[PDB]
Design a protein around this ligand. Structure first.
Ligand SMILES: [Mg+2]
Ligand SMILES: [Mg+2]
Ligand SMILES: [Mg+2]
Ligand SMILES: [Mg+2]
Ligand SMILES: [Mg+2]
Ligand SMILES: [Mg+2]
Ligand SMILES: [Mg+2]
Ligand SMILES: [Mg+2]
Ligand SMILES: [Mg+2]
Ligand SMILES: [Mg+2]
Ligand SMILES: [Mg+2]
Ligand SMILES: [Mg+2]
Ligand SMILES: [Mg+2]
Ligand SMILES: [Mg+2]
Ligand SMILES: [Mg+2]
Ligand SMILES: [Mg+2]
Ligand SMILES: [Mg+2]
Ligand SMILES: [Mg+2]
Ligand SMILES: [Mg+2]
Ligand SMILES: [Mg+2]
Ligand SMILES: [Mg+2]
Ligand SMILES: [Mg+2]
Ligand SMILES: [Mg+2]
Ligand SMILES: [Mg+2]
Ligand SMILES: [Mg+2]
Ligand SMILES: [Mg+2]
Ligand SMILES: [Mg+2]
Ligand SMILES: [Mg+2]
Ligand SMILES: [Mg+2]
Ligand SMILES: [Mg+2]
Ligand SMILES: [Mg+2]
Ligand SMILES: [Mg+2]
Ligand SMILES: [Mg+2]
Ligand SMILES: [Mg+2]
Ligand SMILES: [Mg+2]
Ligand SMILES: [Mg+2]
Ligand SMILES: [Mg+2]
Ligand SMILES: [Mg+2]
Ligand SMILES: [Mg+2]
Ligand SMILES: [Mg+2]
Ligand SMILES: [Mg+2]
Ligand SMILES: [Mg+2]
Ligand SMILES: [Mg+2]
Ligand SMILES: [Mg+2]
Ligand SMILES: [Mg+2]
Ligand SMILES: [Mg+2]
Ligand SMILES: [Mg+2]
Ligand SMILES: [Mg+2]
Ligand SMILES: [Mg+2]
Ligand SMILES: [Mg+2]
Ligand SMILES: [Mg+2]
Ligand SMILES: [Mg+2]
Ligand SMILES: [Mg+2]
Ligand SMILES: [Mg+2]
Ligand SMILES: [Mg+2]
Ligand SMILES: [Mg+2]
Ligand SMILES: [Mg+2]
Ligand SMILES: [Mg+2]
Ligand SMILES: [Mg+2]
Ligand SMILES: [Mg+2]
Ligand SMILES: [Mg+2]
Ligand SMILES: [Mg+2]
Ligand SMILES: [Mg+2]
Ligand SMILES: [Mg+2]
Ligand SMILES: [Mg+2]
Ligand SMILES: [Mg+2]
Ligand SMILES: [Mg+2]
Ligand SMILES: [Mg+2]
Ligand SMILES: [Mg+2]
Ligand SMILES: [Mg+2]
Ligand SMILES: [Mg+2]
Ligand SMILES: [Mg+2]
Lengths: 158, 134, 258
RNA sequence: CGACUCUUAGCGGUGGAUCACUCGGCUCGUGCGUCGAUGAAGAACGCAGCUAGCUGCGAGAAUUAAUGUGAAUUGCAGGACACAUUGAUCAUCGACACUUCGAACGCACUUGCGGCCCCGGGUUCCUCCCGGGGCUACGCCUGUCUGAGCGUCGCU
RNA sequence: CGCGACCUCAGAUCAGACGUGGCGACCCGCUGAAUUUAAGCAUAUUAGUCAGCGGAGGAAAAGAAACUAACCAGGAUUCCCUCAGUAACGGCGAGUGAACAGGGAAGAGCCCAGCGCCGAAUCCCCGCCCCGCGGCGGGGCGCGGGAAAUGUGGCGUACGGAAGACCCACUCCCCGGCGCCGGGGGGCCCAAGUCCUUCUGAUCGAGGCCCAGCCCGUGGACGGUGUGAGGCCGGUAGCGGCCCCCGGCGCGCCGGGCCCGGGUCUUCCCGGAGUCGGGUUGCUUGGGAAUGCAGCCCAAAGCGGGUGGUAAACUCCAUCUAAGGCUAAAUACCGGCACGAGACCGAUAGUCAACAAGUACCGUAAGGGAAAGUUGAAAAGAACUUUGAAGAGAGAGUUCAAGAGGGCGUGAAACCGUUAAGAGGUAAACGGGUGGGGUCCGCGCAGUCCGCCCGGAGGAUUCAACCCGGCGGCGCGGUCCGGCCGUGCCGGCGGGGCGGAUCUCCCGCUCCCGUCGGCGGGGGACCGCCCCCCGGCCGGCGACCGGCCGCCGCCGGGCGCAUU
RNA sequence: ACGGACCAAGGAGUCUAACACGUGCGCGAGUCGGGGGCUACGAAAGCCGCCGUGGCGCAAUGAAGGUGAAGGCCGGCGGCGCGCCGCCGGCCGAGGUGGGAUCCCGAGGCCUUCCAGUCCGCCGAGGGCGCACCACCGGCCCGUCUCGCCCGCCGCGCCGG
RNA sequence: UGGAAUGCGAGUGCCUAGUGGGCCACUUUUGGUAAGCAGAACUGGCGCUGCGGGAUGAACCGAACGCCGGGUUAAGGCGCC
RNA sequence: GCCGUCGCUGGCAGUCGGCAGAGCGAGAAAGAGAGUGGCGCGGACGCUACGCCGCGACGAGUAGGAGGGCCGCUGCGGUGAGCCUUGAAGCCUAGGGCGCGGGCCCGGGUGGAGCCGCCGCAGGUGCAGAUCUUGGUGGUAGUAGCAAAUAUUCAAACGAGAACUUUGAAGGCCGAAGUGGAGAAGGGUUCCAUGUGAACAGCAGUUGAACAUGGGUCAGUCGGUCCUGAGAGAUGGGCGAG
């Protein structure tokens, strides 16, 4: 029975909700599992960036958000062809590649090209054969001063 | 405090791992201190009590300076029976009164080919801990 | 919480009216004691408790960050008053000065004999002696739930870099350690009362301003924090009340009893 | 005064509350996350010197081998054990073994009837009879083997 | 008639494999209610839920768009916050109820058929050789047998790809050992009081242990030990030790593989049908002129097809490319093994079950299903004497205690027996008021002390006042010296750090010819705050003082010889 | 009228979500890390701001397309016929009335032998600014109706204001 | 001269349990022969409320309650109980 | 007179002391105000201001509401240099008391190991009932009853013990559709022997189908085994999400 004055509130408790109750008592016991496997991963990939492959710069749809910029999924094969990186060798130097992306504009295509240049210039490559350097490979003076970068690589700032 | 996350600080779990301990573990549980005459010789503080050792009681009704031979180690009761620690039943026959190994000090070990290995083991890990400290 | 199946693992239906029995459900048939004996309901033996405790009770509380910081600054401003420390019980009748700061070499300590010698040289040893004189067995069912022994809380020791000082002190009863960058109120104010006895180290006594900072210089280590303001400055209402400013503006006291 | 009855106190009985203990539960969290025709889970029946139940095990039957340990097990007997030409007791457990029913598998489920092959007694290959061992369930895949068709043909 | 193929189909205890059943907390596919709500009830709700059936794994399922969108666009799946109690559904009542975007955890892609190209360039099986041999493989032989042209392998898949030519670039990539190079499990061990007195039945209790403040402490968690133990024992701490096994990550060597790429032109080729789709029927969905699924009928196309949340026609655009397949991580887990913990319960509670419990017991069965912990430190578990047939007693003894005596800790209440005291014909009991008697208490029974003063008899190493030393209070010491601070105030040929939606030499890269303009980056200038040195005052030191000076008080040491 | 022979132990407004009001606390036109991340008791505590996404608050109104919260005086110009209308350049500026805690001014006065005579206070006739709040009247925004006359220009219009 | 008397500090805002079977009496009063009946109006009670009286008593007369000492009353009483 | 509530939105920081001067109860808005000229070193209590003090009026109460509990239960963080084998919890008590009460504190006893005061925190926190639940115990009550089927008696034995056991002698019943002698189903050791007298055999037992010790069921021909009956039930096939 309703009281004098109040809300008409509909509680969604007409199903057997006590059976399907989800308690978060393992949230602190899984934050440590994620952090542990994140440092087992940051130890498995020794000098490679800890965050993973570099992501492109990407506007958002939906006029609510179409003025912020974000980090997409990968660099479109158009931007890889402009930057001169084979689409099957990009994934082996930590460049993200998704083919689904189009490029209608240019102000973003050139921004992601400049981004690939800014990454393929900061990239310290180790020689495939350790005991023998190669042609396209950073010299041992770099390789000895090559560290593992934490956090996202080339972070995106509005 | 204890920081090993795999050891049980619980009460009833140690009071259960105690009473339901296998015999070979109850042998270590029934250890006993060495007398200060064998301590400055061997560098060993306690030893799992064996059968034929000479011992002397220090706590209880039968505590004194009389030394006796350990007559038997009744490891199921967590007790031992010594030569002349006993009692008279009503009719007159005598029974051995059980003493806990922790209330009794050993004055002459029965050196086997194995109690020598255990002694030299303890001595080894003790000089290793002294070099670990100094 | 109790089990969710407890008290309900039986099958029992009421006998109904007639039978001159109290109409509670009863266990079915059987040639045993527990046969037609009353099954559910809090009143019956066996049976289910009233409103069985559940595991989605609200156990954890959340507090505003600025209010946890207000409480930390209020639990630190109260540790520099000889009355609010001698009233929590600490034996500091011979401490040379309350904000007890010590040189940085203390962090280089690795033996507990060094910490004992220090706590004696600073005349802080009567508090660990008080913890000793206060160590006794608990009272109640807490003894059989891994809370068998209890004692008193001793001085706290604030540090900045762990060069082995937790290893050095963690074997003295009552001594608890606390990093500056992670001050815990559940440790600075044990039991909920203010006025615990703390022992700082100069390298930690010189980060308190970079952590909270005076009312004109903000906190440097926090994002945006300034010490809480004061609702009254001259808290000495004795000096306020017997002051000619106010003393002159009063009517004569009517201290005659009629 | 006496009996009986009532009340209070003393002690004594019936009963086992209260308190004090706790090798038990409940809940939370963590790691792994593995059964079976090479016979699972379950059931049945057996095995101890003295043994009913529990527990352990399977005719090698309260356990075998191996390794670690290093002198007991114990309720009483008895029995091992230079403690080193050699190892009591426990724990571990990778070798071996593991009765009948059970997906349960020769046919049935009484414990009844078989068929085939190879051994031992019987015989002296004379099949008989007895004992021992191995086979003989249903679907299904790859290939092998033998076949069916006035199915489609070719040659005789 | 016979012979030999091929197709279709049987028979084997044929050679070699595979499945079956159990568990089921979580997961996948179907089947599927009614209690209840609506104050009735019938649609709805409960609910795609309970029950039922099938199938798995340590996760499963999903998964690299026939997608979201309408932007300046996003780009596999799964998960959390939020969207959101929203859009929507609904006797538009009860009630029900998503998605997009955004922030996060994780992050990974791929593969066929087809279309073509290649001498089927491919695969399985048996026999023999050598090795490897406890996850059945590697290499060699076999005019050895099959599968397969009704299509095996390599390239290749929508992100385009293939082929010829021009160019440049170019030798590790993989598996198998042989052999050596420094995480997990298991076994063993590593500090210090039984130190002196004293309680007890027994100490782990109480006091002490100088000036090494009894000893150790990276070990003062816990358990046991005749209450209560850092130091008696096991343990705990420790990038402590020793010894076994497993594995990974490593480096050489052998025998194998694999004979390889990109860029510009040129010629070519490019896709999944009783499927989509439409009608209609039933269920389901928030999906409303049908969200999804399924049955029946019709039944396609290829600049085609689907989607663009209102049915239809026309015309534009956006968006993917269905009808074939695989794919870890983030995610779930009241079952299993092994663990740790708790502001939980503490034997009528907590599991039904602390115990020979899914046992005893009931039911013909499906099923139902308990009650039941505690002698004592140790059995030291009462020898022996004695009456009685025995149970039972009376002595005696064990124990600190039998006032703990084998269902024995403590041993309440109801109920009963006996002893003591009182009482009694309106059932008993009760409240108010007294009296009588009892029981103990007051440790009652000669009754309070305290201050001053007066006198009366005695005893001090004693009062005042001075001197020395120390200490403390106060000081408008009008305004003494020197400090320190100010959620004070101004100045400065001052240094510095934070911030700024206040402005402006080199550099990345960009369009136009090293000239020339836009912008990605640190200076620099500037503004505010803060900090630190500089001078000025101001004012505090009562949340924050030091020395000399003054006054006062106190203590101690003198001096006082006693009408104090 | 119904339950009750006696005694022991057990025994009944609990927890979660939502909402409303009241209350304490912190910050305050802001507020909050709850999700995520970084650093024995501790599964705690601390931290993140280029993690404040997002929630709630800061704007309402309409079914919607949508729109979205004082004005006045002054000259100068055009128009109507002294006012108004539009149009440029000035200054003034966020209503008013009534009640209204509080505060402010203050005629006069608060004694000591007698008058003048200043400072400090306090009382006080009367007069004021008026907190919060209440009543009333105006004003402003959106929807809607009625009557009207004008201004705008890349698209002069079934246009916009 | 705050425009009759007497008395008394008022005004306002949220949140809110229980209740929603009533009954009796004086007076008026409808149906009914009437009823300790059914049904209304005004006020007071019982319910929710003891105490003295009416021998007894939900409702009648007096009178409303913290625990006590003295005094005096109400309504009723004063042969004995 | 005492207790309490309400109101006075009452009074008290003035304990202002040899740096002193001890007042604001009195009918009448406001200063025991400033300046400007004519010896003996002394003085109770108070004030946890959430405290203390003074005045009046008041004091019912179901349903209901609110407050205050130094009322009580169990655990948690602190704190009592807390209590305790020279005796904790618990329980009993014609002992002494406190508080209006919830309740509490002492003394004596029993008992044998843990327990409490305060400030906060938390809750499965207070019982007279619910034909409440479980367990224990009463009056009824030494009462109802131990009454279906005719019947017992004498002597002896064993034995502590005899209406009931055993023997013998009498008298009786069942009266071959039996109270006889054997089997099927079912039971499962009840069979047989010795001993025991705790429990049971609704009195007693020297006895038992009780208890404790040990024994015992022998097949070519007796049955099962085999065959079919009513019927049950695979494969083939069909149906079926399964
Ligand atoms: Mg209501
Ligand atoms: Mg229960
Ligand atoms: Mg008991
Ligand atoms: Mg208790
Ligand atoms: Mg047996
Ligand atoms: Mg063996
Ligand atoms: Mg072994
Ligand atoms: Mg048969
Ligand atoms: Mg209904
Ligand atoms: Mg209803
Ligand atoms: Mg109904
Ligand atoms: Mg429905
Ligand atoms: Mg639904
Ligand atoms: Mg369905
Ligand atoms: Mg189900
Ligand atoms: Mg099934
Ligand atoms: Mg299966
Ligand atoms: Mg598996
Ligand atoms: Mg999968
Ligand atoms: Mg695709
Ligand atoms: Mg998406
Ligand atoms: Mg999204
Ligand atoms: Mg991430
Ligand atoms: Mg391929
Ligand atoms: Mg092909
Ligand atoms: Mg001591
Ligand atoms: Mg102990
Ligand atoms: Mg200890
Ligand atoms: Mg010690
Ligand atoms: Mg040790
Ligand atoms: Mg030790
Ligand atoms: Mg360790
Ligand atoms: Mg359905
Ligand atoms: Mg539905
Ligand atoms: Mg923990
Ligand atoms: Mg129980
Ligand atoms: Mg019990
Ligand atoms: Mg109990
Ligand atoms: Mg139970
Ligand atoms: Mg009980
Ligand atoms: Mg006892
Ligand atoms: Mg005990
Ligand atoms: Mg007892
Ligand atoms: Mg009695
Ligand atoms: Mg008498
Ligand atoms: Mg009734
Ligand atoms: Mg009754
Ligand atoms: Mg109770
Ligand atoms: Mg409300
Ligand atoms: Mg509020
Ligand atoms: Mg919202
Ligand atoms: Mg009603
Ligand atoms: Mg009526
Ligand atoms: Mg009436
Ligand atoms: Mg009533
Ligand atoms: Mg009533
Ligand atoms: Mg009333
Ligand atoms: Mg009345
Ligand atoms: Mg009368
Ligand atoms: Mg009252
Ligand atoms: Mg009594
Ligand atoms: Mg006793
Ligand atoms: Mg509880
Ligand atoms: Mg009761
Ligand atoms: Mg009778
Ligand atoms: Mg009869
Ligand atoms: Mg006859
Ligand atoms: Mg017969
Ligand atoms: Mg017979
Ligand atoms: Mg009898
Ligand atoms: Mg017999
Ligand atoms: Mg014969």
């Amino acid at each position: 029975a309703p009281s004098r004055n109040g809300m008409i509130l509909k509680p969604h408790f007409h199903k057997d909700w006590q059976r399907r109750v989800a308690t978060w008592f393992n949230q602190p016991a899984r934050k440590i599992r994620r952090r542990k496997a994140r440092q087992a991963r940051a130890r498995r990939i020794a000098p490679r960036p800890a965050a993973g492959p570099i992501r492109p710069i990407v506007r958002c749809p939906t006029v609510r958000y179409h003025t912020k910029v974000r980090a997409g999924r990968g660099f479109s094969l158009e931007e890889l062809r402009v930057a001169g990186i084979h689409k099957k060798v990009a994934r082996t130097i930590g460049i993200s590649v998704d083919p689904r992306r189009r490029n209608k504009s240019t102000e973003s295509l050139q921004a992601n090209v400049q981004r690939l240049k800014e990454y393929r210039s900061k990239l310290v490559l180790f020689p495939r054969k350790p005991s023998a350097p190669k042609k396209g490979d950073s010299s041992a003076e770099e390789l000895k001063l090559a560290t593992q970068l934490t956090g996202p690589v080339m972070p995106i700032r509005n | 405090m204890k920081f090993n996350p795999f050891v049980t600080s619980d009460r009833s779990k140690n009071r259960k791992r105690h009473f339901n301990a296998p015999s070979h573990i109850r042998r270590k549980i029934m250890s006993s201190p060495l007398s200060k005459e064998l301590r400055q010789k061997y560098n060993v503080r306690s030893m799992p009590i064996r059968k034929d050792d000479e011992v002397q009681v220090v706590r209880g009704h039968y505590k004194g300076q009389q030394i006796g031979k350990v007559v038997q180690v009744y490891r199921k009761k967590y007790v031992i029976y010594i030569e002349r620690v006993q009692r008279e039943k009503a009719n007159g026959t005598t029974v051995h009164v059980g003493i806990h190994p922790s209330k009794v000090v050993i004055t002459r070990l029965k050196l086997d080919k194995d109690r020598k290995k255990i002694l030299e083991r303890k001595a080894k890990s003790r000089q290793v801990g002294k070099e670990k400290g100094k | 919480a109790v089990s969710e199946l407890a008290g309900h693992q039986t099958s029992a239906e009421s006998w109904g009216t007639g039978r001159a029995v109290a109409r509670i459900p009863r266990v079915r048939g059987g040639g045993t004691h527990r046969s037609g004996q009353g099954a559910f309901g809090n009143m019956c033996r066996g049976g289910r408790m009233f409103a069985p405790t559940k595991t989605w009770r609200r156990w954890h509380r959340r507090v505003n960050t600025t209010q946890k910081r207000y409480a930390i600054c209020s639990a630190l401003a109260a540790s520099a008053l000889p009355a609010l420390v001698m009233s929590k019980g600490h034996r500091i009748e011979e401490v040379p000065e309350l904000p007890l700061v010590v040189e940085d070499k203390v962090e280089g300590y690795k033996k507990t004999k060094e910490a004992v010698l220090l706590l004696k040289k600073l005349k802080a040893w009567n508090d660990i002696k008080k913890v000793y004189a206060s160590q006794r067995m608990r009272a109640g069912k807490g003894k059989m739930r891994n809370r068998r022994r209890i004692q008193r809380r001793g001085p706290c020791v604030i540090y900045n870099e762990d060069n082995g000082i937790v290893k050095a002190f963690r074997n003295i009863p009552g001594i608890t350690l606390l990093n500056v960058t992670k001050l815990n109120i559940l440790k600075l104010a044990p039991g909920g009362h203010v006025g615990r006895f703390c022992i700082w180290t100069e390298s930690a006594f010189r980060k308190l301003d970079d952590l909270y900072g005076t009312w004109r210089k903000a906190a440097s280590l926090k994002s945006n924090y300034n010490l809480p303001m004061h609702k009254m400055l001259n808290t000495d209402l004795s000096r306020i009340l017997k002051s000619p400013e106010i003393q002159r503006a009063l009517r004569a006291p009517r201290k005659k009893i009629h």
